[PDB]
Amino acid sequence: KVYDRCELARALKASGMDGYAGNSLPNWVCLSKWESSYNTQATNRNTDGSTDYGIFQINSRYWCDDGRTPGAKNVCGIRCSQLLTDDLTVAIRCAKRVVLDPNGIGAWVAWRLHCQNQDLRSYVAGCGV
């Protein structure tokens, strides 16, 4: 599913993402926008054999099992195909687990690049959340 920006803001807010591990909601909408253009089915294969999955582009080397990634650890304990459903529950649970690591949301290159230190008010503007 390709989410509407505000539809996604509402689903993240309903799922407790607003302030999770200290990351306010605009952070999560900005990252989703630059990592997948709000498309839960986005996939991106990497030079290292790993693949990025879903709306949050979670990588198969450490968080999910796609069965074709060398030296994979599956910390979220899921199949990477569960990160591509229209229903965001498993993606949100795994993203929540990713930001508890020491690097926090800095784990996402798109966040470091386009959201870190920026005004992110536009990302939640007009969502009434």
Instruction: Please list the residues that pair with 52 across neighbouring strands.
Output: 44, 59
- 106: containing domain: 1-129
Per the annotation, the verdict on 86 as an active-site residue is no
Q: Nearest to residue 43, comparing CAs of 11, 83, 3, 70?
A: 83
Resolution limit in angstroms?
1.8
56, 36 contact by CB (below 8 A): yes
- Cβ contacts of 112 within 8 Å, gap of 6 or more: 106
Q: Nearest to residue 36, comparing CAs of 98, 93, 109?
A: 109
Separation CA 17–CA 5 (nearest Å): 15
Among the listed residues 4, 7, 35, 66, the single catalytic one is 35
Among the listed residues 7, 48, 52, 66, the single catalytic one is 52
Total domains, the chain? 1
CATH of the domain at 33: 1.10.530.10
